Design a protein around this ligand. Structure first.
Ligand SMILES: *[C@@H]1O[C@H](CO)[C@@H](O)[C@H](O)[C@H]1NC(C)=O
Length: 364
């Protein structure tokens, strides 16, 4: 258990609002917006998994999201003022208790779907999966209410490329690579079946052979500075409907729902046999779930199939784990294979070869 980080299941901000009796129209309209330098593919509304890291000497524990969509580490600060009530329900980084703290002070702004996180940079020791790196990270002093007033995670560990990082900060994984401690310059991400207790695993330096079956097959990165691959077909049932001419697709551990363009996804929802739409999202009567056809994605000359049980979430109060999202050019129309895709297919992110590997996930 050297370079492994146990991911733990948490109620998502949608699931917290659902359990408090909030209407599905209100949740999407007020907590799930996508506002018009690096690209945003998530609002953390549906994120269900966090890992724990330590920051400082002695180490102060934080619950963080492992987000391949971003390249920055940030956590709430004790410098976070009284105007930001969201800070008052989370763990706070206190430089006063760290002997390894070294100030920087340059301001940063990280944009995401529902809003923006502001603060200042600071250097300290960071322990992630038993590996100690000297990291520059964001001390957040302006944490917005949407969605962090109800989030069950403190902050975000970016697992993206250094080109995506704000203020040109060297990311956490890049520092781990500089140390030459890992067997491979890769990390892989496992989510187990959607249960109440069962969690997941991020492995640094390789892949856990317990959590996959058969063999990995790899797809090259098509855009240099991100986990982005060419998709050559989206199919409902036997019929291939979209992406024959070639779609860009991001594999993102940050968001759990698969994203596509609103027009392309509405076409899929028609052919799926699904009428009801709430903003970006699509709800369905739980009686008609077993009759839904399989969705498939064509990646690196192989099909990756999601069955009815893989892309639907039953919560007490059934919602499809797909949603509309239009990123404009030059970045272009993009799909996002979120954690729903990765739960089915154990994913290896490869930094040396600049490629992404997929394999059929399983339990032990
Ligand atoms: C703060 O961090 C940045 C990296 O984003 C670095 O280039 C800069 O030299 C640092 N500034 C100070 C004053 O330590």
């Amino acid at each position: 258990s050297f370079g492994r980080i146990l991911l733990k299941k948490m109620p998502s901000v949608r699931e917290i609002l659902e359990e408090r009796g909030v209407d599905m129209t209100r949740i999407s309209a007020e907590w799930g917006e996508f506002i018009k330098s690096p690209v945003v593919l998530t609002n953390y509304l549906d994120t269900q998994y966090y890992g724990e890291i330590g920051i400082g000497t002695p180490s102060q524990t934080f619950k963080v999201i492992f987000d391949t969509g971003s390249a920055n580490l940030w956590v709430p600060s004790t410098k976070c003022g009284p105007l930001y009530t969201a800070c008052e329900i989370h763990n706070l980084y206190d430089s006063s208790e760290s002997s390894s703290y070294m100030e920087n002070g340059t301001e940063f702004t990280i944009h995401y779907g529902s809003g923006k996180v502001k603060g200042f940079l600071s250097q300290d020791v960071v322990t992630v999966g038993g590996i100690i790196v000297t990291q520059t990270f964001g001390e957040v002093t302006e944490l917005p209410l949407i969605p962090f007033m109800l989030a069950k995670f403190d902050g975000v560990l970016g697992m993206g490329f250094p080109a995506q990082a704000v203020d040109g900060v060297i990311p956490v994984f890049d520092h781990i690579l500089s140390q030459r401690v890992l067997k491979e310059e890769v990390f892989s991400v496992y989510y187990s079946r959607e249960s109440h207790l069962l969690g997941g695993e991020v492995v640094l330096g390789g892949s856990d052979p317990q959590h996959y079956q058969g063999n990995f097959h790899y797809v090259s990165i098509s855009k240099a500075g991100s986990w982005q691959i060419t998709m050559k077909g989206v199919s409902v049932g036997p019929a291939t409907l979209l992406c024959e001419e070639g779609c860009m697709a991001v594999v993102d551990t940050g968001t759990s729902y698969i994203s596509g363009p609103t027009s392309s996804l509405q076409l899929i929802m028609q052919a799926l046999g699904v009428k009801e739409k709430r903003a970006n999202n699509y709800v369905v009567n739980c009686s008609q779930v077993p009759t839904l056809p399989d969705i498939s994605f064509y990646l690196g000359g192989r099909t990756y199939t999601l069955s009815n049980m893989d892309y639907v979430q039953k919560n007490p109060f059934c919602i499809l784990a797909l949603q509309g999202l239009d990123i404009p050019p030059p970045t272009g129309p993009v799909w996002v294979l979120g954690a729903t895709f990765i739960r089915k297919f154990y994913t290896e992110f490869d930094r040396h070869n600049n490629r992404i590997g997929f394999a059929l996930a399983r339990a032990a």
